[PDB]
Structure formats: structure tokens, C-alpha cells
Amino acid sequence: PISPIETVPVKLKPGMDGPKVKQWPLTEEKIKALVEICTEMEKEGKISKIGPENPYNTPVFAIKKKDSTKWRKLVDFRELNKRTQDFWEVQLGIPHPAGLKKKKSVTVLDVGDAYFSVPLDEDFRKYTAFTIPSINNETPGIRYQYNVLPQGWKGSPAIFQSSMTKILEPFRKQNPDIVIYQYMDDLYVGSDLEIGQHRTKIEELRQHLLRWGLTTPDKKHQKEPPFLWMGYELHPDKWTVQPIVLPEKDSWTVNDIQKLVGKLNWASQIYPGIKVRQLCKLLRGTKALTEVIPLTEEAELELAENREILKEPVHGVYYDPSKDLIAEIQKQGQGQWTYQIYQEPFKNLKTGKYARMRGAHTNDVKQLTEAVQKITTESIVIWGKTPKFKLPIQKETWETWWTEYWQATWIPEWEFVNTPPLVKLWYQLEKEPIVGAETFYVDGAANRETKLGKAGYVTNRGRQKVVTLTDTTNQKTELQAIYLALQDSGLEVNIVTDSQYALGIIQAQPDQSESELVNQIIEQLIKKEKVYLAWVPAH
Amino acid sequence: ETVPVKLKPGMDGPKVKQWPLTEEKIKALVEICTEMEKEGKISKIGPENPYNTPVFAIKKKDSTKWRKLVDFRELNKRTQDFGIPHPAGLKKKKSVTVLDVGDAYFSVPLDEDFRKYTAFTIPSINNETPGIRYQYNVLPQGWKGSPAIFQSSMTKILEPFRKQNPDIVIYQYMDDLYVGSDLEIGQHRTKIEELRQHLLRWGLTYELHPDKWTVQPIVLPEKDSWTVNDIQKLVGKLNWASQIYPGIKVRQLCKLLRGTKALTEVIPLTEEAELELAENREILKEPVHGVYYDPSKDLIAEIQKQGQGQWTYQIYQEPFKNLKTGKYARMRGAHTNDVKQLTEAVQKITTESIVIWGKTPKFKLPIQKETWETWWTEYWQATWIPEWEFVNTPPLVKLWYQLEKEPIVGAETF
Ligand SMILES: COC(=O)[C@@H]1CS[C@]2(c3ccccc3)c3ccccc3C(=O)N12
């Protein structure tokens, strides 16, 4: 009942050798149980009884199930594995509903024994030997080695998928109209043929596989649409988001809050209306996971709002290669971005949110370019295409910014969509000195060790100032200088500084940063009607 | 017959990941590969092979067809060593032409044991299908062991054209052949055809002018009247420049800045202060002494975006000791695509670089890794790929080099 499938050449890691771990002792109950399960496998050709001619071993653990609650079998190959060659990384990236195309009908075959069905490389079998213990470790144990892909073995997933692919090859060509997806033990089949035809084609596949050993279970195990695909319910002509339930408890532990926020966060993608601020202030100063933190009123609130939100149903449409692929983005708050990708207005294939990007120093447009790139990459992955962007920024602003930004940046084909708030340049340093406006020669200095300093200015007009600072830094005294010049000056100002950090501001003009200082400066910059900032060598 | 080929000691084959590709590029690659498979150049492989190397589809002018491009960079580095001392005279021809002799490789089989390491992957949309895994059976374009193992064959095929035309240099690099002669624009092209035609009777099928390349100097401004700001900016530029020309001095000039006057306030240039500037200009009339290309050190290419489609770059191995420097203006059709301009500029520098020291420079790119990795390939046209790192352009570097001189009027190209 094995197979006529060619085996894959498997080799041990470079210079390593097979495992040699003594067998764990088990009860008389667990022994007859394994002697059971196993005595079966030997017949089905899955395993072959071997003698002390094999220096290798792997521990076997007998544990019951919940289905028949009878003793099952478990083999720990953890050792053999880390002694087993590296294979080709198996599909870790799965399909996404938004990239699927509508089908007339979809099925799903469960190639359960997918593993014990595919033969193991004849030479490698020797290493997959395990020993069935004896009562009281008395007489010797019964040796066994796998002939098939062992469940839990490193090579098993990749070697089964391969075999599966080779097996499906002919069927794939004998009829393109039928799209097939292998996922672990599952084969998901879809087509745009009428149900009668499809069902028949399914049957054909089933018997074709059976022509290679691989069999499909009965009517009891069979799965029927819609399918639960990573948070989604897949209907052949539509996807619906699987409703997520938020527990209704009276005492929340830290673990509980952290697992709640996680859920909330993922939901945030499909539902951009979700909030978690108030649930996130609860983890403050927490001393232990099992700690019980009482939900504040605010936490009790948003937790509620989210429930009703998560009530609303969210369904979707599949990808029509024939229509436009569009992607619209919204700036939902400094560094917070929302995007919905669609084809038919108001009919999303996919929505999403990017965490609040918060780095050392950027501006809202560069952040927009980043949101835009990520969506591009996701899109290329999901549809092998790049959506047409609808962005809340004016072609003018875009043009002004990038054409002159120090860094190469880009936004694929895109169109302006006037949906407030639009992203804009919060300010623009003058290109040239401002005639008329006051000139603040600023300078801050501090003993980096004592952390004492002075930040001040002397204008050409006569105005001057100096403030002593404690527990500061040179960077901060310098920035404190520029900051004072900004407060004490009118709507137009010229500031000359030797601050190297200034120079960075001049070339990147950040409208947000990690330091509250630069932040203050930025707020001041945003207020002025004109600001010319100039650098000069220090000392 | 195949020559034995190994990796460097203790160096394992590349296990690099395949970037996602557009539908059109996948469709094209699948086509290109089914045929190479048909033609016995590559073969499908199993899960036992853990290796992988990036691939994509490019498309140079005069083509509706797509070319497959494998990024053997990682592999090339791990590939054992084995080329020519480079024709120092190449950098002198009135006009050089590049040739893609990449196909002259599938003829030669690849040592059976090295095949695994050439494993590549044709990605699938939405992960709906696992990759179509392959590996080469022949010498692959883009691999460095190829031009080597096929050297002699290339030697024998070129001589006849070489002797008939000794006033024409034939330098090879990767899948490329650079032909440079001093014949007139027409008498030169007709010669390429003769070399190609000659090359044509086998399995092989860019026009630059090295002697035109001139390392331009730095030109300090000469305002009508100078303001405080004017000087402050000049001093900074000059002061930073000190690092390259230790003779450049800002002493006097800096003394005209000992006043808290308006930035727009005009300042009179003292006689001494003008001498100082005069001398700095002198010092800046020629490339610094002592710069010698070391073939035992990596060639470094750094670029800065000067905005408005303009780019500047320096090729060097030591800091501030430039072997070459230049300004690059974007090409027609790229007004709104920094990435395109960048890859173009990057390809030019490489090309110039190849011509001069016969090897590619490690590049320093003023672009974000994500932005580059997502779109460079969409405008790549060369058969080779240089090494690169992404960096933040320092404010002064850009300010100092946008300073270089440009044509009096242009090129007067009637
Ligand atoms: C990707 O195309 C396929 O191979 C398969 C075939 S079945 C599946 C599918 C099932 C499970 C996971 C992923 C897809 C599907 C279901 C619902 C609507 C369309 C499709 C489709 O084309 N998919």
C-alpha cells in the first residue's frame, strides 16, 4: 500500500551521523498499545522490523487520542532532524484571499497519510529506527525502521510536497481549467466548470492519486465550504471575514490583556476603527503575567466600542484580472497609515494598516513613500502587479519635495484624491537668507561630563540671551540654542549655527523626530512664515 | 568536456531568497526556462537541494523579448579564483562599443558537482504554486567561472579580427566585450559589424567614448559682491575641502565673519582675503597629487543626489583621494523616477569603471534599501551586477561636488 514514487536522495548533515538515544521506558499498557499500532504499520509496509544490525535509535512515546481515546504513537525525531541535511525552504508564504480568482466551485481533499504514503530514501531509513520497550526493561526491545516519510521528520514536508507536485504534473496539463493548491496534507481544488463536470474531475483526481497510493478519506472526514483560511471564510465566489469574539470576563490578567491586544491588533487590519491605547495603558509596571489588572473606565469603554465594531460583518470579492487594481491610502495620524485595495469602488479585496512608524527623524511625505512601497511589495506578491495609487497628497507637494530631497525616492503611477487630511510639507526652509528678517547667531555649549551648558543667541539687531542648563548635552544645548532663537524671534528669522545636527535638519527638514527637543524646534519651524537656517564651521 | 570547479575553501553554496516578480516577468521567465530545459541547458531539481540564487527578467532596447538575469553575485564570491591584466589603452579610444557575448556559454557543460549551486527559482503569484526549481547543466551567463572556463575558446575566436584590426582593442568582462577604435563614427560601427558577424558564425550577438571623459575641477563662485551668508557658505565648503587639499585656507576670509551682522549684509573683501581665495582657486585647479589606483584594494563608488535630475559621484579607494569624479544628468524619460536615474547612473559608473580598471566598484547609494530592492531591476540593463550599500549622504559632500565645472555652452552638437 506504499508507492511507485521515486524517492528523494536524502543525506546526513556534513560529517554528522545518525542518532543514538536510548529508548524511554514505558508501562505494560503503553507497550501492548505500541506493539499494536506498530504491528499494523509493518504490514502496510510503513515500517520494517530490523535487528541489532542498526546502531541507531529514536525514542517512541505512546499517548492516547481524543477521537477514540485509545493509545496512539508518537516518535520524537528532534535528534535525527538536527542531524538531517537542510532542504529547500518549503512554502512559508501562503495565498491571500485578495489574490484568489472567483471559482464556480471549490473542493478540498485531505491526503491524510500523505507522509506514510510517500517512500523514504532507501538509504536513509536506517537512521529512522525506534525501539518498542519491554515490560520492566527486561528482555530486549522490538526494533523498527521507517520506510516512509516519518511524521515529524525534517525532510517529510518538503519531500511530500515535491512528490505531490510530480504526481499532479500530468493532471495539471491534462486540464488547465482546474487550479490546484497543496497545503500540508490538503489539496484545495477549484474550477470554473459546472458542478457536475467539476465533481467528476474531482473524482478523477481522487482515483489518479489513488493510482499512486495517496488516498482520500470518506464522507465523515470530508471538508465542505466555506473554508477557514487564516482568519477568512472562503466561499468560491466571495470571502467573508471569520467573526472574531472578544471574551467577556470580569477579571483580566496581564496575559489576557496582551493576548487581547494581539487579537485587536490583527483585527485592526480588516477593521481600521479599532483602538487599543487604553488597553495597552494597563500593562504599565505589570509585575507578572498572571497579575490581575482591573480595566479602567476608558479601558472598559474602548473594549466595548470594539465589540460592536467587531460585530459589523466584513465580506469581500476575489480578484478580477480584467479590472483595475487600485490602492487608496489615508494618513490616520502622524506616522499612522490606512489603505484599502479594490477594483470596484467600495468593494475591497484587501484593507490594511501600518503600525505607527516612529524613527529618529522623517517627514510625512517620506513616510507616505514608505507606506506606498510596502503596499507595492504586498501587491506584487499577491497579484504580481502594482496598484494605481490614490494618495492624499497634491502632485505639487509631491513634486516640490522629492525632486529636491537628498534621497532617491519614488511613487509608482499615482493619482491625487482629495480626502482630508491631505499630507503636506509642514514647513520649508528658505533657499536664501531673508533680507529684513533678524539674524540670530546661536550657540549652545555644555561640558559633556558635567552635563551643564548654556544656549543663547546674539542677533544683529541687538537682542541676546543665555540660559544655563543642567543635565543636558552638547547636541541639546545646540538645539536648545536654535530653539530659543525661534521662540524669541518674529515671523521671519535667519538662524546661523555650527550645530552639525542642524545641517541634517537643513537637508532633510524633518516634521517629526525621536527627541521632544527637535520636536519643539519643528513646532517652532512650522509656526514661522520664513526661516533661513545656515551652517558654518565651528571653532 | 568539463573542468573540475570548486567553491572556495569552507564556502558553502548560496542560499539567497528570490524576490517577488511581476506577473509579466514570471510568465517570461517560465517561457525562457521551459526552452532552456528543452535545450538541455537547465534541468528541474528536487527538495534535496537547499541552494538558491535570485533571478529576474530584464529587457534592453531593440527588444520585445525578455532576457533572463540571474544574480550570481553571492555565488561568484564563493566561487574559487582562477582573466586578463586589462588593456590600459582601452581608456583612450575615441569611441568604445560594448558586446553581449553571453550566449557563447551554454555550449560548454558545467562540472556535474557544481550544478547544485546554480539552483534558482521561478516564483509564483500569490504563492499559489511552489517555485519551479532548476539548476544549470551548462556555464551560466553572469557567473564568473564562465568567462574564465571559456577564455581560450574566446581567445581563438577573436585573434583573426584582432590581427586584421590591430588598432582596435578587445577587452572582455563577464558576458561583455568592449571594442574600442579611433575610426570615425561610421568606419567604427562597420567594424563592430565585422567583429559581430565574425562572432555571429558561432553563438554570440552601448557606445561610449573614454577619451572624452575629463575629470572636471572645482570652481569656487565669483559673486559680484559678497554677503555674510555668501562667505559663510564659501568658508564651510572650503574648510571641509581642507581634508582633500591641506593648502586650502580660510583664515583671512573667516576674519571677515567676526561680526554679528545680517546674513544679507555685504562684506568688503580685504586684499589679503582675496589672495587667500585666489590661492585656494589655484590649489583647486588640479586633482590632488599622490592618487594611484591600487589593484589590491576595493574600488569605491559614492553617489549624491544633487536634485533636479543631477547626480554626482566619486570613484576612489581611499577617503578623499579620488581616482575619478563626475556629474550625471538623468536621461530622457525619467523626469519623475529617482530610481531609474539612479540605476542608470549606477550602470554608467560601473561601465566607465570597467573600462578603466577592468572591475566593478562597491557602490554607496543615497537611497533606502527597500526602495532600491523593489525597483532597480525594473530599469537594469547590464548583464553584470555590482555590489552596493545604502547610505545617508553627508550634507557637505553634496555641497562640495555640485561645485564642479560644466561646459561653456554644452557640446555644440550641430
Ligand atoms: C490558489 O488557487 C488554488 O490553488 C485554489 C483552488 S481552491 C482555492 C484555495 C483554497 C485554500 C487556500 C487557497 C486557495 C480557492 C478557494 C476559494 C476561492 C478560490 C480559490 C482558488 O482558486 N483556490
Swiss-Prot record, chain B:
Substitution effect: Y105F: Confers resistance to abacavir
Effect on the protein upon substituting D62E: Confers multi-NRTI resistance
Result for mutant: Y178C: Confers resistance to nevirapine
Domain Reverse transcriptase: 39-208
Consequence recorded when altering G307E: Confers resistance to abacavir, lamivudine and zidovudine
Known outcome of mutating V70L: Confers resistance to HBY 097
Protein name according to UniProt: p51 RT
Gene (UniProt): gag-pol
Range covered out of full length: 593 to 1027 of 1435
